[PDB]
Paper text:
The overall structure of FabX predominantly consists of a large canonical TIM-barrel fold subdomain at its N-terminus (residues from 1 to 266, including β1–β8 and α1–α11). A chloride anion was found locked in the oxyanion hole and is stabilized through hydrogen bonds with E175 and G180 mediated by nearby water chains. In addition to the canonical TIM-barrel fold core, FabX was unexpectedly found to contain a small [4Fe–4S] cluster-binding subdomain at its C-terminus (residues from 267 to 363), which has never been observed in enzymes involved in the fatty acid synthesis. The subdomain consists of six α‐helices and two β‐strands (α12–α17 and β9–β10), and four cysteine residues C300, C304, C308 and C320 hold the [4Fe–4S] cluster, a second electron transfer component other than FMN, through coordination bonding interactions.
The bifunctional dehydrogenase/isomerase FabX is an essential UFA biosynthesis enzyme in the widespread human pathogen Helicobacter pylori, a bacterium etiologically related to 95% of gastric cancers.
Numbering used by the authors: -2 to 363
Write the structure that this text describes.
Amino acid sequence: HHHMVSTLKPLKIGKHTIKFPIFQGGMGVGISWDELAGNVAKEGALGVISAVGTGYYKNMRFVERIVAKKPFEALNFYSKKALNEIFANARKICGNNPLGANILYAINDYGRVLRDSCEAGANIIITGAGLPTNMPEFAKDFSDVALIPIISSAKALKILCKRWSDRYKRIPDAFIVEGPLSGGHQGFKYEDCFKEEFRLENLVPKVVEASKEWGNIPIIAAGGIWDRKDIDTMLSLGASGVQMATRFLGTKECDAKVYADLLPTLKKEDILLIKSPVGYPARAINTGVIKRIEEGNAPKIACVSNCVAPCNRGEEAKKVGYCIADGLGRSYLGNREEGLYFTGANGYRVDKIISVHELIKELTEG
Ligand SMILES: Cc1cc2nc3c(=O)[nH]c(=O)nc-3n(C[C@H](O)[C@H](O)[C@H](O)COP(=O)(O)O)c2cc1C
Ligand code: SF4
Ligand SMILES: [Cl-]
């Protein structure tokens, strides 16, 4: 099939080069695992395996202990064996094309999961949901692995570079700037999530300018980027690449097969900004456990997987009404009644489900 050769340039992040300056954003739980990330990387963009809740893989085939049908504790929720299998299966598809691992800073056992991801063969670690000031501590035995914090401000870039340099004589290999149209957790206070000051086109120049002090660390723009026109806009503002997730949530290869049923139906009015036990606002779909909370028949809360430090073993889950480990795991397992479902602001524009191959050609041709 004819597609004009791309005029986008390969992107180098630390020692690793991707053919197109595009990341498929990590998506937990079980949304961007081996089929999605492996195919993205095969097509020459960065495939990103989510390392969160890997115990759910293949309906908890790889955990050591199950309690109440949930992976027991962080040891089993972030399953090393499952993570190894996901990366191995991804490599069957993409070979030496680089892969990232996405790890929220908020998770319990963060350092162990970072090391597991390096040991599983990741080229790149991507971390948001916090200010990951000690990320090099856990990566120092794997100096080939590139490290990429997700930030929302020039301030955060400066703090991370200062503190990493002072303490590890290292600075990040790239930064992802995640704007307020992104799916999942926002890097903004709730009251700032619908404020034009923080729209991505305003953030990118400020972060790029701050990056000059440190040698023009590549800035990767994320949140609300839909097509090549939006990619070109971000590159013209000084970004070196983009990270996109909602478009990939709409592909056949997505590992959470429920989304191919749900997304073509998604109406804009059903896109919500909700509280989360992680402690950041989250963009979610008004369906599943969120509807059960409204009805009053949502699952009782009981911290089994101990997924994130901010929740304090159920304290915040009880306040917000749901357990994010249980809810996200249920969605990977196909549970429409009690799953938790995330989306970017653009999720309502997904009409048809296309292949990763077709998507990458659409975004890169010309
Ligand atoms: C369904 C879904 C799940 C997500 N889960 C994560 C996650 O686990 N970790 C993370 O850093 N970002 C997560 N995100 C954010 C994406 O990686 C990405 O940065 C953002 O959605 C990009 O905006 P776009 O969706 O408009 O392209 C998620 C996004 C979506 C849509
Ligand atoms: S109760 Fe809180 S810490 Fe425990 S598994 Fe649920 S969201 Fe995670
Ligand atoms: Cl998130």
